[PDB]
């Protein structure tokens, strides 16, 4: 019965491809051809935060657009003040092999994970004054690549063992697990309403999950290599995925196919981080080519470059109010542009 | 500045703490241990004293060796191998008794890697007496079809050493080979002298005189 099942799968894939092709009547570039370009975007370094001594691997913005947490291989996770460049907290990690960090929306907790296969939650607003490890989620057999706080109680984590699992910080048990990826899942992003999320695996595919039901919904495969970053549009109906093929693409949830590709002839390094602007008109992507390029989300052309980093940029993030952008790199320097 | 001066004082204090921690932690000697499965890695990591990554730190002649046994990560190497750069040396362990084509392929993959173009490899060959007994029982031509010569233990060992050492191409790194039977306490001095030589080479390169 294996042959019949294989034939059924092949015909289902053919039907899916035909349906995706049929919905395409005009590309995004064909409709946004009569709008004025945004012009040259000149961004200057306003602040520089020099606290880390190792390669910075992840960073996150605060919900008030003022606080920022940064994690590096030195085994520390510092909390930054963007307006005054002061340091509020310095949390020492148990394992120095850290590859992700998250900041709670309410500002009470900070997550951390890496090669130790355990997600560690820290408590900031403690009555004794110091920061204490509130929980240690240990259920994964592979390195944890991403973790995002859904709320103060439950957190979703993406792991390198081809699995994604929703946790419960109250009791530390896997409430729900998401399976289906063939390779390592190295990216994750939550919806504005925290009702659904997508994962970007190393098998050049992206899947659409929902936290409540716990089943995959749609699969977007257009890339040719490992997907390193992902992020939704502010409206919540589209997302952009950057891969190692030196190109980042725009996918539409409702159209269920591609919209445009953001590639240049003089670009060879793979994408490391992708982020959107507050209005969604500017798509800033980090490159392994030592520079950050600002892409026009509707015109598919370069509006400027963010140069000034001595190494590969590992992470980038736009504030909640859209005021500034922060970029972290492997030379242990974090820069705020405006 | 009314009461933000206390915040500035706190920030300066924790910045000083970070600097002190970095200076204190910069003195550790890092080593990466690789090799095929069931090749005696556990024997050597338990021979010099003391689930994802297993770190075994010990002190020998004022050198704090931080040895990372990362064999527990059954995933794609390319997605996490880049964080192990800046390591002093790579220890490579291979079982001479058995599991040899895989070892050669792994050595070729790890010696020509982009991030490890300057890190020298300290290669170990344990189970010498098991290999000698097997030679006395079976010829060494079974593993290598293209091996021609006398079937002595020394000849076979030298041939395997040459085949392993010929895989490198970068002028800036050298392969250190040693013979062991795992029934010995000499697996710590070899690492020590190789690490000292690598330190001298790195210092000479950094000063620009090399």
């Amino acid at each position, epitope marked *: 019965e294996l042959d019949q099942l294989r034939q059924e799968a092949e015909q289902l894939k053919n039907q899916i491809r035909d349906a995706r092709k049929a919905c395409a009547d005009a590309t995004l570039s064909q409709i946004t051809n009569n709008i004025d370009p945004v012009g040259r975007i000149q961004m200057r370094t306003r602040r520089t935060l020099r606290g880390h001594l190792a390669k910075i691997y992840a960073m996150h913005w605060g919900t008030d657009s003022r606080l920022l947490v940064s994690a590096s291989q030195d085994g520390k996770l510092i909390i930054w003040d963007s307006y005054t460049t002061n340091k509020v907290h310095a949390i020492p990690l148990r394992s120095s092999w850290v590859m992700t960090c998250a900041y709670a929306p309410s500002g009470n907790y900070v997550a951390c994970g890496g090669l130790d296969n355990i997600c560690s939650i820290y408590n900031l607003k403690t*009555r*004794e004054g110091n920061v204490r490890v509130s929980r240690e989620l240990a259920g994964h057999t592979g390195y944890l690549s991403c973790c995002r706080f859904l709320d103060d109680n439950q957190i979703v984590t993406s792991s390198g063992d081809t699995t994604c699992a929703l946790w419960d910080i109250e009791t530390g048990q896997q409430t729900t697990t998401f399976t289906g990826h063939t390779g390592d899942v190295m990216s994750l992003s939550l919806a504005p309403d925290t009702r659904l999320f997508v994962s970007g695996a190393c098998d050049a595919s992206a899947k659409l999950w929902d936290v409540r039901e716990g089943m995959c919904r749609q699969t977007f495969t257009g890339h040719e290599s490992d997907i390193n970053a992902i992020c939704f549009f502010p409206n919540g109906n589209a997302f952009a995925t950057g891969s190692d093929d030196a190109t980042c693409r725009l996918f539409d949830l409702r159209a269920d196919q591609e919209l445009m590709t953001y590639s240049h002839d003089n670009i060879i390094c793979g994408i490391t981080s992708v982020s959107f602007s507050k209005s969604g008109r500017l798509l800033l992507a980090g490159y392994d080519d030592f520079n950050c390029n600002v892409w026009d989300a509707l015109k598919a052309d370069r509006a400027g470059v963010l140069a000034g980093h001595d190494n590969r940029v590992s992470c980038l993030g736009v504030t909640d109010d859209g005021m500034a952008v922060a970029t972290g790199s492997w030379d242990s320097f974090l820069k705020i542009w405006n | 500045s009314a009461e933000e001066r*206390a*915040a500035l004082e706190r920030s300066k204090a924790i910045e000083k703490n970070l600097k002190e921690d970095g200076i204190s932690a910069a003195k550790d000697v890092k080593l990466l241990l690789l090799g095929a499965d069931n090749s005696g890695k556990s024997t050597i990591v338990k021979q010099m004293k003391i689930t994802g990554i297993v770190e075994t730190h010990f002190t020998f002649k004022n050198l704090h060796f931080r040895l990372f046994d990362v064999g527990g990560q059954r995933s794609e190497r390319k997605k996490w191998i880049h964080c192990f750069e800046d390591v002093t040396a790579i220890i490579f362990c291979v079982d001479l008794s058995d599991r040899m084509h895989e070892s050669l392929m792994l050595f070729d993959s790890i010696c020509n890697n982009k991030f490890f173009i300057d890190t020298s490899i300290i290669l170990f060959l344990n189970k010498k007496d098991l290999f000698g007994e097997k030679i006395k029982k079976s010829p060494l031509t079974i593993c290598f079809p293209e091996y021609t010569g006398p079937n002595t233990y020394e000849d076979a060992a030298a041939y395997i050493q040459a085949q392993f050492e010929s895989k490198n191409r970068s002028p800036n790194k050298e392969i250190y080979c040693h013979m062991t039977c795992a029934t010995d306490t000499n697996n710590a001095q070899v690492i020590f002298d190789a690490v000292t030589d690598i330190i001298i080479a790195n210092n000479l390169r950094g000063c620009g005189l090399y």
Partner: single-chain antibody, 233 residues
Framework: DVQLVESGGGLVQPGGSRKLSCSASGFAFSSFGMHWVRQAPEKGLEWVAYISSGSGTIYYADTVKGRFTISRDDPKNTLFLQMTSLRSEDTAMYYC??????????????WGQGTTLTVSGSDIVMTQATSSVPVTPGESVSISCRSSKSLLHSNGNTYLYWFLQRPGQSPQLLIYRMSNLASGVPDRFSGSGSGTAFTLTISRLEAEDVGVYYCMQHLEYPLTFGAGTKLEL
């Protein structure tokens, strides 16, 4: 839990000396700045001294500099106040306060118990107009406290503090920075103001809310307390 027990108070002859200890336990004493607050038998509170985290900065009041000195012992988790040349006006019951400072912190959150000590120009003048108000349960009471200077700094934060001292107990922080409610305080307490004139609103006053209410500013040292409006049943 958090405990600040202090002792070393008693009858002292005039012109003598006395050494006071503030034992602390249950919290990280090393990163907390400690104050010293006294209270006259029939008057309000009066700031005395201050030591910072790491023994960086030390300040004294106008009537305190030179005679007194404040020191801490971080490994022993104790705060010390060597006070010398006791005059007749130094009688009070001295408190111990922890005031950790950072962005979003809550200074003056926890107060000590107190030791009785029976002894034989440009500063901000902060005054409360009314010193006594009669209240009844179920009603709303509002207390006002005017400041001589403008307390609103250029960064947008006004430094006004509100405290409540129940009969026979120690003062408890209620409002910090004139708009933020301290942790543990019931939500019925609210505060407001604009630059110079400040007011605090109490809704659905209960029998446990009886006491004397003080207003305090933290703009610059020295710190001046208010006259103290007393609300009685």
């Amino acid at each position: 839990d958090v405990q600040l027990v202090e002792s070393g108070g008693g009858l002292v002859q005039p012109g003598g000396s006395r050494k006071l200890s503030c034992s602390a336990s249950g919290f990280a004493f090393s990163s907390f700045g400690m104050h010293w607050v006294r209270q006259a038998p029939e008057k309000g509170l009066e700031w005395v001294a201050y030591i910072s985290s790491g023994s960086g900065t030390i300040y004294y009041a106008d009537t305190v500099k030179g005679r007194f000195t404040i020191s801490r012992d971080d490994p022993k988790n104790t705060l010390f106040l060597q006070m010398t040349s006791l005059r007749s006006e130094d009688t009070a019951m001295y408190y111990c306060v922890r005031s950790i400072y950072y962005y979003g912190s809550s200074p003056f959150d926890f107060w000590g118990q107190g030791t009785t000590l029976t002894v034989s120009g440009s500063d901000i003048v902060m005054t409360q107009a009314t010193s006594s108000v009669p209240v009844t349960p179920g009603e709303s009471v509002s207390i006002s406290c005017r400041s001589s200077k403008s307390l609103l700094h250029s960064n947008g934060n006004t430094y006004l503090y509100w405290f409540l001292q129940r009969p026979g107990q120690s003062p408890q922080l209620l409002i910090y920075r004139m708009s933020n409610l301290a942790s543990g305080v019931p939500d019925r307490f609210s505060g407001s103001g604009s630059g110079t004139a400040f007011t605090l609103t109490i809704s659905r006053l209960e029998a446990e809310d009886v006491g004397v209410y003080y207003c305090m500013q933290h703009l610059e040292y020295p710190l001046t307390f208010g006259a103290g409006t007393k609300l009685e049943l």
